[PDB]
Design a protein around this ligand. Structure first.
Ligand SMILES: O=C(O)CCCOc1c(F)cc(-c2c(C(=O)NCc3ccc(C(=O)O)cc3)noc2-c2cc(Cl)c(O)cc2O)cc1F
Ligand SMILES: O=C(O)CCCOc1c(F)cc(-c2c(C(=O)NCc3ccc(C(=O)O)cc3)noc2-c2cc(Cl)c(O)cc2O)cc1F
Lengths: 365, 362
């Protein structure tokens, strides 16, 4: 039953998890990411920051996994994800006393982060496998599902924040001292063409749709640059984040469109509008897929119904102070909207708030 | 000598009884129906009145002592007392039933003014005691409850007065009180637009045109009808049309061509959905919440309580009204209604120790 958990205690994991969970994550601004990848920033500064910050981020969400209901925590797949987090925490602990001045320390660190990044590739579908194990062994009682939903939103946001920190280090400090003008600052494109990412997400969605259905709706894109009419819309953002969101929304829109036109020769196209206002960058994906009743929208956002594309797409949106909302018209079609900050100064990491007291203070006149 | 508190304390110990749209429909014009309605409403109205009256008396003293709030409270006392006269009277006596119906019409007329008067009180509080953000989430909470309470009470009174009025050739003989069992949604959309266009034309010399598309999913060619209260649907559509037109005209101050307001009406198995789309330039996501706030909304064609109260009408029969904007482009407002009259049940404020503690905390 409990071999992975035994192996973890014998490793001293709890000592370290208890230690690092006593501290709060440090949220970084988009500006801080940009500047910490400008030349003036150092591999040593990043090393000394990430060898404290990663373990704190890892320890906090590890503490929180161990607060799940025992019916889920004892699922093989959850125990497995927990073992990957122990290994990764331990991996970074090797670096606590090592010398920043030593070029071999910095090199080994970067390789450890890449190993960690690769270790955690399958985390999402594995945690989903654990939730299915719980669902298909116990009930579908609506109290335990708002519990799992709460934890999973935190876990997956935590995970996005950790891969971001690792991606910035590995991509910026990939071995040698490199030439002048990098197109990206790590994973951040400071001149991200939103429509190019829409087309990318569509291209891959259309490929998959064409494999499994043999039809796929076409794409129409309109841009609205309010301030500068008809200038192509750029922003500072992480294209892979925007792509993850758009990919999932394209898959759902295409599924609904194809499944609601079994007998049609024309498929209604998927319409995407990109609007840039003073404060918001807004991306509407409109389909004529026959829509969902208002009562079942909540379900689309639930891990208990992978299925995890929409919930996790929302988490990516929320991570840099955005949102993702979905409005359907049963009998007609569905509108999905990504809301992003137009300004890079308005973009700070939104991280789960940890170490809140279980004791609630009472309030008077 | 006249013991409002006695009665307020008594009737507030009971829970309102939510009715289904079906239950409203089933009430025939019979003497047997009039008696059932009389004996039901002489308990239910006072319970509905007592509950929201108890809750007004828990508001912060900064609000409760405003002239306009004291006034609304006095109208609720008068109306409660009015109904109390009927508690021991005989339903079997035809003169009892007739006097009751006249009392309800008097009550209906007494409360015509209530919405702008409560709003006047909120302005009195704002402009005397300011905006500390704790007391504003308190007033928002109270106002949503008060105005939903009010919709549920006018519905009960409207059904009684309109059904048991007793005039020979009525206005709407198709209707069961205020309920149209064959309500043509698009006809109400056109009505709401016509009045909105009139007002828009008065205050600006331009007004956007209307386009309507219907999607009857099950029965493709057939015009979309439902069981609903047309006046409810009209209040919601009127407010949404006024806002869309205001935004459209103010974002094209110098344009001779205005982009039209597009309305789609979709009927699915469960939902009837009405989307109103404008190219009014839209609102940033951060300010949507404000549009739904009683504290912000003096309309800075503007009323301010229109959107919050339109949502309450939507929620009253288990619907919703949501707005999604695209800053720089335009706004979509959606009314969600139940397609089926069996799914349509009164949503009333839940009255209990937890709901009444919100006026002590955060
Ligand atoms: O399950 C998950 O958590 C996410 C997995 C995701 O899988 C879904 C999927 F790709 C598409 C739909 C769907 C339908 C539908 O046509 N049918 C589903 C059904 C269910 C019940 C009823 C009914 O009771 O009438 C009607 C339609 N209509 O619009 C959407 C739709 C949903 C999303 Cl999230 C989107 O971004 C775009 C869309 O067009 C529902 C999905 F679920
Ligand atoms: O009567 C009522 O229910 C509420 C009445 C409060 O008055 C408002 C109003 F009618 C319309 C808008 C508005 C604007 C706009 O942009 N208006 C001007 C402005 C522009 C920029 C900003 C900003 O950048 O902050 C703020 C306001 N764009 O779309 C809407 C809009 C709003 C609603 Cl609720 C609707 O159903 C349809 C709409 O098109 C905003 C209101 F506030």
């Amino acid at each position: 039953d409990k071999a992975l958990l035994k192996n973890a205690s014998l490793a001293g994991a709890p000592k370290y998890i208890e230690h690092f969970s006593k501290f709060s994550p440090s949220p970084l601004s988009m500006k801080q990411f940009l500047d910490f990848g400008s030349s003036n920033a150092c591999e040593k500064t990043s090393f000394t920051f990430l060898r404290q910050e990663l373990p704190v981020r890892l320890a906090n969400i590890m503490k929180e996994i161990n607060l799940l209901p025992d019916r889920v925590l004892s699922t093989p797949s959850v125990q497995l994800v927990q073992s990957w987090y122990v290994q990764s925490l331990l991996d970074i602990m090797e670096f606590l006393d090592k010398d920043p001045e030593d070029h071999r320390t910095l090199s080994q660190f970067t390789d450890a982060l890449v190993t960690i990044r690769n270790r955690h590739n399958d985390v999402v579908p594995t945690m989903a496998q654990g939730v299915l194990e719980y669902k298909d062994t116990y009930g579908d009682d609506p109290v335990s599902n708002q519990n799992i939903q709460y934890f999973l939103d935190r876990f997956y946001l935590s995970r996005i924040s950790i891969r971001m920190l690792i991606n910035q280090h590995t991509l910026i400090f990939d071995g040698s001292t490199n030439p002048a003008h990098p197109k990206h600052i790590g994973s951040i494109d400071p001149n991200c063409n939103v429509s190019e990412v829409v087309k990318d997400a569509y291209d891959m969605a259309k490929l998959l749709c064409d494999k499994y259905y043999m039809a796929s709706p076409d794409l129409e894109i309109q841009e609205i640059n309010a301030a500068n009419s008809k200038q192509p819309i750029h922003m500072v953002y992480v294209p892979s984040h925007l792509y993850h969101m758009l990919f999932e929304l394209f898959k759902n829109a295409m599924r609904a469109t194809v499944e609601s036109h079994e007998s049609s020769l024309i498929l209604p196209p998927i319409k995407v509008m990109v609007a840039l206002g003073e404060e918001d960058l807004s991306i509407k994906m409109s389909d004529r897929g026959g829509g969902v009743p208002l009562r079942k929208i909540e379900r689309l956002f639930s891990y208990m119904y992978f299925g995890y594309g929409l919930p996790i797409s929302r988490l990516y949106a929320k991570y840099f102070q955005g949102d993702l909302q979905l409005f359907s018209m049963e009998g007609f079609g569905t509108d999905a909207v990504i809301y992003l900050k137009a300004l890079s100064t308005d973009s700070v990491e939104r991280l789960p708030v940890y170490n809140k007291s279980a004791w609630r203070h009472y309030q008077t006149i």
